[PDB]
Amino acid sequence: ATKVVCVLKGDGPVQGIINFEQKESNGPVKVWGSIKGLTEGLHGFHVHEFGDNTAGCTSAGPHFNPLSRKHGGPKDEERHVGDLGNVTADKDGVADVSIEDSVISLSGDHCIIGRTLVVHEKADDLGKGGNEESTKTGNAGSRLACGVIGIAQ
Template sequence: MMQSIAITLALCATICAAAQTRNTPIEAIAYVSGPAQADGSQVKGNVTFTQNDCGQNVHVRVQLEGLKEGKHGFHVHEKGDLSNGCASTGAHYNPDKVDHGGPDHEVRHVGDLGNLEVNSSGVIDITYTDKVISLTGNRGIIGRAVVVHELEDDLGLGDHVDSKKTGNAGGRIGCGVIGVNSDVDEWPCRDGGVGGLRSSLSILAVVVALFLSRSV
Protein backbone atom coordinates (compact mmCIF):
# COMPACT_ATOMS: atom_id res chain seq x y z
CA MET A 1 0.00 0.00 0.00
CA MET A 2 2.75 2.43 0.97
CA GLN A 3 4.50 1.73 -2.33
CA SER A 4 1.31 2.51 -4.24
CA ILE A 5 0.90 5.77 -2.35
CA ALA A 6 4.50 6.77 -3.09
CA ILE A 7 4.11 6.01 -6.80
CA THR A 8 0.84 7.93 -6.99
CA LEU A 9 2.28 10.94 -5.22
CA ALA A 10 5.30 10.93 -7.51
CA LEU A 11 3.05 10.83 -10.56
CA CYS A 12 0.95 13.65 -9.18
CA ALA A 13 4.03 15.77 -8.56
CA THR A 14 5.29 15.13 -12.09
CA ILE A 15 1.98 15.99 -13.70
CA CYS A 16 1.48 19.13 -11.62
CA ALA A 17 4.96 20.30 -12.56
CA ALA A 18 4.16 19.75 -16.23
CA ALA A 19 0.96 21.72 -15.81
CA GLN A 20 2.81 24.82 -14.70
CA THR A 21 3.47 27.32 -17.48
CA ARG A 22 6.89 28.81 -17.84
CA ASN A 23 7.18 32.45 -16.91
CA THR A 24 8.78 33.41 -20.22
CA PRO A 25 7.18 36.47 -21.82
CA ILE A 26 6.36 36.48 -25.51
CA GLU A 27 7.54 39.69 -27.15
CA ALA A 28 6.95 41.20 -30.57
CA ILE A 29 7.96 44.54 -32.07
CA ALA A 30 6.99 46.73 -35.02
CA TYR A 31 9.40 49.33 -36.38
CA VAL A 32 7.11 52.09 -37.58
CA SER A 33 7.83 54.62 -40.29
CA GLY A 34 5.89 56.70 -42.75
CA PRO A 35 6.34 59.02 -45.72
CA ALA A 36 7.64 62.53 -45.19
CA GLN A 37 4.80 65.00 -44.69
CA ALA A 38 4.44 68.41 -46.36
CA ASP A 39 5.90 70.14 -43.30
CA GLY A 40 8.94 67.85 -43.35
CA SER A 41 7.86 65.72 -40.39
CA GLN A 42 7.94 61.93 -40.55
CA VAL A 43 6.40 59.39 -38.24
CA LYS A 44 8.94 56.90 -36.90
CA GLY A 45 9.61 54.78 -33.85
CA ASN A 46 8.54 51.40 -32.57
CA VAL A 47 5.67 49.59 -30.89
CA THR A 48 6.41 46.70 -28.54
CA PHE A 49 3.93 44.00 -27.53
CA THR A 50 4.56 41.75 -24.51
CA GLN A 51 2.41 38.86 -23.31
CA ASN A 52 3.50 37.08 -20.12
CA ASP A 53 1.62 33.91 -20.94
CA CYS A 54 -0.92 32.61 -23.42
CA GLY A 55 -4.42 33.81 -22.63
CA GLN A 56 -3.20 36.84 -20.70
CA ASN A 57 -3.55 40.51 -21.60
CA VAL A 58 -0.97 42.11 -23.88
CA HIS A 59 1.14 45.04 -22.71
CA VAL A 60 1.65 47.60 -25.47
CA ARG A 61 4.38 50.23 -25.46
CA VAL A 62 4.21 52.95 -28.13
CA GLN A 63 7.31 55.07 -28.75
CA LEU A 64 6.82 57.37 -31.73
CA GLU A 65 7.88 60.80 -32.94
CA GLY A 66 6.99 63.07 -35.85
CA LEU A 67 3.28 63.18 -35.09
CA LYS A 68 1.07 66.24 -35.18
CA GLU A 69 -0.53 67.35 -31.94
CA GLY A 70 -3.89 65.73 -31.31
CA LYS A 71 -5.43 62.26 -31.48
CA HIS A 72 -4.47 59.68 -34.10
CA GLY A 73 -6.26 56.42 -34.83
CA PHE A 74 -4.09 53.41 -34.00
CA HIS A 75 -4.88 49.92 -35.25
CA VAL A 76 -3.57 46.49 -36.13
CA HIS A 77 -4.27 45.81 -39.81
CA GLU A 78 -4.71 42.37 -41.29
CA LYS A 79 -1.67 42.16 -43.59
CA GLY A 80 2.02 42.51 -42.89
CA ASP A 81 2.52 43.73 -46.46
CA LEU A 82 4.39 46.99 -47.02
CA SER A 83 4.97 46.48 -50.74
CA ASN A 84 2.86 49.59 -51.42
CA GLY A 85 3.61 51.32 -48.14
CA CYS A 86 0.88 51.47 -45.53
CA ALA A 87 -1.79 51.19 -48.24
CA SER A 88 -1.11 47.47 -48.70
CA THR A 89 -1.70 46.47 -45.07
CA GLY A 90 -5.37 45.78 -45.75
CA ALA A 91 -8.27 46.51 -43.44
CA HIS A 92 -8.37 46.43 -39.66
CA TYR A 93 -7.63 42.97 -38.28
CA ASN A 94 -11.16 41.67 -37.67
CA PRO A 95 -11.34 37.86 -37.52
CA ASP A 96 -14.66 38.03 -35.65
CA LYS A 97 -16.33 39.97 -38.51
CA VAL A 98 -17.92 42.58 -36.23
CA ASP A 99 -18.31 46.37 -36.28
CA HIS A 100 -15.51 48.78 -35.46
CA GLY A 101 -15.36 50.08 -31.91
CA GLY A 102 -13.15 51.43 -29.17
CA PRO A 103 -10.59 49.36 -27.25
CA ASP A 104 -12.88 49.12 -24.20
CA HIS A 105 -16.05 48.33 -26.17
CA GLU A 106 -17.64 44.92 -25.92
CA VAL A 107 -17.92 44.83 -29.73
CA ARG A 108 -14.74 45.84 -31.59
CA HIS A 109 -12.26 44.62 -34.14
CA VAL A 110 -9.36 42.71 -32.62
CA GLY A 111 -7.17 45.38 -34.19
CA ASP A 112 -9.04 48.35 -32.67
CA LEU A 113 -6.46 49.96 -30.37
CA GLY A 114 -8.16 53.36 -30.13
CA ASN A 115 -6.27 56.64 -30.35
CA LEU A 116 -2.80 57.93 -29.62
CA GLU A 117 -3.05 61.32 -27.93
CA VAL A 118 -0.01 63.41 -28.82
CA ASN A 119 1.11 66.71 -27.30
CA SER A 120 2.79 69.64 -29.04
CA SER A 121 6.21 67.92 -28.99
CA GLY A 122 4.99 65.40 -31.56
CA VAL A 123 6.46 62.62 -29.41
CA ILE A 124 4.58 59.90 -27.57
CA ASP A 125 5.84 57.23 -25.15
CA ILE A 126 3.02 55.36 -23.47
CA THR A 127 2.38 51.89 -22.09
CA TYR A 128 -1.04 50.32 -21.66
CA THR A 129 -2.74 46.92 -21.64
CA ASP A 130 -5.13 45.46 -24.20
CA LYS A 131 -7.37 42.52 -23.33
CA VAL A 132 -8.34 41.41 -26.85
CA ILE A 133 -5.23 41.12 -29.00
CA SER A 134 -2.86 38.19 -28.51
CA LEU A 135 0.55 37.15 -29.75
CA THR A 136 -0.59 33.57 -30.32
CA GLY A 137 -3.73 31.67 -31.26
CA ASN A 138 -6.66 32.71 -33.41
CA ARG A 139 -6.28 36.38 -32.42
CA GLY A 140 -2.54 36.46 -32.90
CA ILE A 141 -1.17 39.69 -34.39
CA ILE A 142 2.38 38.62 -35.24
CA GLY A 143 3.01 39.00 -38.97
CA ARG A 144 0.33 41.67 -39.29
CA ALA A 145 0.89 45.44 -39.22
CA VAL A 146 0.35 48.37 -36.89
CA VAL A 147 -0.92 51.52 -38.57
CA VAL A 148 -1.06 55.10 -37.31
CA HIS A 149 -3.70 57.31 -38.90
CA GLU A 150 -3.84 60.99 -39.71
CA LEU A 151 -7.05 61.75 -37.81
CA GLU A 152 -8.85 60.84 -34.62
CA ASP A 153 -10.69 57.52 -34.54
CA ASP A 154 -14.34 58.17 -33.63
CA LEU A 155 -14.48 54.64 -32.11
CA GLY A 156 -17.53 53.76 -34.16
CA LEU A 157 -19.63 56.40 -32.45
CA GLY A 158 -19.75 58.95 -35.27
CA ASP A 159 -22.34 59.39 -37.98
CA HIS A 160 -19.89 59.07 -40.87
CA VAL A 161 -20.44 56.21 -43.31
CA ASP A 162 -17.06 54.77 -42.30
CA SER A 163 -17.53 55.03 -38.54
CA LYS A 164 -18.50 51.38 -38.10
CA LYS A 165 -15.73 50.25 -40.47
CA THR A 166 -12.65 52.34 -39.76
CA GLY A 167 -13.61 54.99 -37.22
CA ASN A 168 -13.19 57.58 -39.99
CA ALA A 169 -9.57 58.03 -38.93
CA GLY A 170 -8.27 59.32 -42.25
CA GLY A 171 -5.08 58.46 -44.11
CA ARG A 172 -2.28 56.18 -43.01
CA ILE A 173 0.78 58.14 -41.92
CA GLY A 174 2.91 55.41 -40.39
CA CYS A 175 3.06 51.63 -40.25
CA GLY A 176 5.24 48.64 -39.47
CA VAL A 177 5.11 44.85 -39.55
CA ILE A 178 4.81 43.11 -36.19
CA GLY A 179 7.70 40.67 -35.88
CA VAL A 180 8.92 38.17 -33.30
CA ASN A 181 11.31 39.62 -30.73
CA SER A 182 11.80 36.64 -28.41
CA ASP A 183 13.05 33.07 -28.66
CA VAL A 184 10.22 31.03 -30.19
CA ASP A 185 11.46 27.87 -28.47
CA GLU A 186 10.83 29.52 -25.11
CA TRP A 187 7.23 30.56 -25.76
CA PRO A 188 5.05 29.15 -22.96
CA CYS A 189 2.09 28.62 -25.30
CA ARG A 190 3.97 26.00 -27.31
CA ASP A 191 3.66 23.33 -24.62
CA GLY A 192 2.01 24.96 -21.66
CA GLY A 193 -0.72 27.47 -21.00
CA VAL A 194 -4.37 26.89 -20.36
CA GLY A 195 -4.65 23.97 -22.79
CA GLY A 196 -1.64 22.19 -21.30
CA LEU A 197 -2.95 22.78 -17.80
CA ARG A 198 -6.35 21.30 -18.63
CA SER A 199 -4.77 18.22 -20.21
CA SER A 200 -2.45 17.69 -17.26
CA LEU A 201 -5.27 18.07 -14.74
CA SER A 202 -7.32 15.52 -16.67
CA ILE A 203 -4.47 13.02 -16.43
CA LEU A 204 -4.07 13.81 -12.73
CA ALA A 205 -7.77 13.06 -12.15
CA VAL A 206 -7.37 9.65 -13.79
CA VAL A 207 -4.33 8.81 -11.66
CA VAL A 208 -6.12 9.76 -8.44
CA ALA A 209 -9.18 7.73 -9.45
CA LEU A 210 -7.01 4.67 -10.09
CA PHE A 211 -5.34 5.04 -6.71
CA LEU A 212 -8.66 5.39 -4.92
CA SER A 213 -10.10 2.34 -6.67
CA ARG A 214 -7.13 0.20 -5.60
CA SER A 215 -7.26 1.39 -2.01
CA VAL A 216 -10.91 0.41 -1.52
Protein backbone atom coordinates in the same frame (compact mmCIF):
# COMPACT_ATOMS: atom_id res chain seq x y z
CA ALA B 1 7.25 34.94 -22.11
CA THR B 2 6.65 36.16 -25.73
CA LYS B 3 8.03 39.61 -26.84
CA VAL B 4 7.31 41.20 -30.31
CA VAL B 5 8.32 44.66 -31.71
CA CYS B 6 7.15 46.97 -34.56
CA VAL B 7 9.12 49.81 -36.29
CA LEU B 8 6.60 52.36 -37.72
CA LYS B 9 7.80 54.02 -41.00
CA GLY B 10 5.98 55.87 -43.83
CA ASP B 11 6.40 58.45 -46.65
CA GLY B 12 6.20 61.36 -44.12
CA PRO B 13 8.20 62.30 -40.97
CA VAL B 14 6.17 60.03 -38.58
CA GLN B 15 8.32 57.17 -37.17
CA GLY B 16 8.22 55.12 -33.93
CA ILE B 17 9.09 51.84 -32.11
CA ILE B 18 6.23 49.91 -30.35
CA ASN B 19 6.89 46.83 -28.14
CA PHE B 20 4.31 44.12 -27.22
CA GLU B 21 4.76 41.66 -24.27
CA GLN B 22 2.34 38.88 -23.13
CA LYS B 23 3.24 36.89 -19.93
CA GLU B 24 0.35 34.31 -20.16
CA SER B 25 -0.76 32.26 -23.24
CA ASN B 26 -4.10 34.24 -23.34
CA GLY B 27 -3.55 37.04 -20.78
CA PRO B 28 -3.35 40.82 -21.43
CA VAL B 29 -0.80 42.30 -23.93
CA LYS B 30 1.28 45.34 -22.79
CA VAL B 31 1.72 47.69 -25.83
CA TRP B 32 4.31 50.47 -25.14
CA GLY B 33 6.83 52.64 -27.04
CA SER B 34 7.22 56.10 -28.65
CA ILE B 35 6.05 57.69 -31.97
CA LYS B 36 7.38 61.13 -33.16
CA GLY B 37 6.62 63.59 -36.03
CA LEU B 38 2.85 63.49 -35.19
CA THR B 39 0.48 66.51 -35.09
CA GLU B 40 -0.49 67.33 -31.42
CA GLY B 41 -3.64 65.39 -30.32
CA LEU B 42 -5.30 61.97 -30.92
CA HIS B 43 -4.25 59.51 -33.69
CA GLY B 44 -5.99 56.19 -34.56
CA PHE B 45 -3.85 53.17 -33.51
CA HIS B 46 -4.90 49.85 -35.16
CA VAL B 47 -3.55 46.39 -36.05
CA HIS B 48 -4.45 45.95 -39.78
CA GLU B 49 -4.94 42.47 -41.37
CA PHE B 50 -1.82 41.93 -43.59
CA GLY B 51 1.95 42.20 -42.93
CA ASP B 52 2.07 43.43 -46.57
CA ASN B 53 3.97 46.70 -47.37
CA THR B 54 4.24 46.02 -51.18
CA ALA B 55 2.44 49.38 -51.91
CA GLY B 56 3.13 51.20 -48.59
CA CYS B 57 0.66 51.15 -45.63
CA THR B 58 -2.31 50.70 -48.10
CA SER B 59 -1.35 46.98 -48.66
CA ALA B 60 -1.98 46.26 -44.90
CA GLY B 61 -5.72 46.01 -45.78
CA PRO B 62 -8.47 46.79 -43.20
CA HIS B 63 -8.43 46.61 -39.34
CA PHE B 64 -7.67 42.96 -38.27
CA ASN B 65 -11.31 41.69 -38.04
CA PRO B 66 -11.32 37.85 -37.68
CA LEU B 67 -14.83 37.82 -35.99
CA SER B 68 -16.36 40.04 -38.81
CA ARG B 69 -17.64 42.76 -36.36
CA LYS B 70 -18.07 46.58 -36.79
CA HIS B 71 -15.37 49.14 -35.73
CA GLY B 72 -15.36 50.34 -32.08
CA GLY B 73 -13.15 51.57 -29.21
CA PRO B 74 -10.95 49.00 -27.39
CA LYS B 75 -13.40 48.98 -24.39
CA ASP B 76 -16.42 48.23 -26.71
CA GLU B 77 -17.60 44.56 -26.99
CA GLU B 78 -18.49 45.32 -30.68
CA ARG B 79 -14.95 46.00 -32.10
CA HIS B 80 -12.28 44.70 -34.53
CA VAL B 81 -9.47 42.67 -32.81
CA GLY B 82 -7.09 45.40 -34.14
CA ASP B 83 -9.11 48.33 -32.63
CA LEU B 84 -6.53 49.61 -30.03
CA GLY B 85 -8.23 53.08 -30.03
CA ASN B 86 -6.08 56.29 -30.00
CA VAL B 87 -2.56 57.40 -28.96
CA THR B 88 -2.07 61.05 -27.81
CA ALA B 89 0.85 63.12 -29.26
CA ASP B 90 2.11 65.94 -26.93
CA LYS B 91 2.81 69.56 -28.11
CA ASP B 92 6.28 68.40 -29.45
CA GLY B 93 4.54 65.75 -31.69
CA VAL B 94 5.69 62.74 -29.52
CA ALA B 95 3.15 60.04 -28.46
CA ASP B 96 4.46 58.09 -25.39
CA VAL B 97 2.37 54.90 -25.96
CA SER B 98 1.27 52.65 -23.03
CA ILE B 99 -1.81 50.39 -23.61
CA GLU B 100 -3.07 47.12 -22.02
CA ASP B 101 -5.39 45.08 -24.33
CA SER B 102 -6.91 41.58 -23.79
CA VAL B 103 -8.55 41.11 -27.29
CA ILE B 104 -5.21 41.16 -29.23
CA SER B 105 -2.77 38.27 -28.45
CA LEU B 106 0.78 37.11 -29.40
CA SER B 107 -0.69 33.53 -29.80
CA GLY B 108 -3.99 31.88 -30.96
CA ASP B 109 -6.53 32.97 -33.66
CA HIS B 110 -6.20 36.64 -32.43
CA CYS B 111 -2.35 36.58 -32.99
CA ILE B 112 -1.10 39.94 -34.45
CA ILE B 113 2.46 38.60 -35.30
CA GLY B 114 3.12 39.00 -39.07
CA ARG B 115 0.34 41.67 -39.24
CA THR B 116 0.73 45.50 -39.53
CA LEU B 117 0.49 48.18 -36.78
CA VAL B 118 -0.70 51.55 -38.27
CA VAL B 119 -0.80 55.09 -36.73
CA HIS B 120 -3.39 57.24 -38.61
CA GLU B 121 -3.74 60.94 -39.68
CA LYS B 122 -6.65 61.87 -37.30
CA ALA B 123 -8.44 60.69 -34.11
CA ASP B 124 -10.35 57.37 -34.20
CA ASP B 125 -14.01 58.42 -33.45
CA LEU B 126 -14.53 54.91 -31.86
CA GLY B 127 -17.60 54.26 -34.12
CA LYS B 128 -19.61 57.30 -32.83
CA GLY B 129 -19.22 59.50 -35.98
CA GLY B 130 -22.71 58.66 -37.35
CA ASN B 131 -21.57 57.55 -40.87
CA GLU B 132 -20.59 54.29 -42.67
CA GLU B 133 -16.84 55.17 -42.40
CA SER B 134 -17.11 55.56 -38.55
CA THR B 135 -18.27 51.87 -38.23
CA LYS B 136 -15.41 50.67 -40.59
CA THR B 137 -12.29 52.88 -39.94
CA GLY B 138 -13.41 55.28 -37.12
CA ASN B 139 -12.68 58.18 -39.61
CA ALA B 140 -8.97 58.09 -38.55
CA GLY B 141 -8.07 58.92 -42.20
CA SER B 142 -4.74 58.20 -43.99
CA ARG B 143 -1.97 55.82 -42.75
CA LEU B 144 0.98 58.07 -41.64
CA ALA B 145 3.29 55.14 -40.71
CA CYS B 146 3.14 51.32 -40.37
CA GLY B 147 5.36 48.26 -39.70
CA VAL B 148 5.09 44.43 -39.75
CA ILE B 149 4.89 43.02 -36.17
CA GLY B 150 7.92 40.75 -35.66
CA ILE B 151 9.52 38.51 -32.99
CA ALA B 152 11.89 40.56 -30.74
CA GLN B 153 15.12 39.71 -28.80
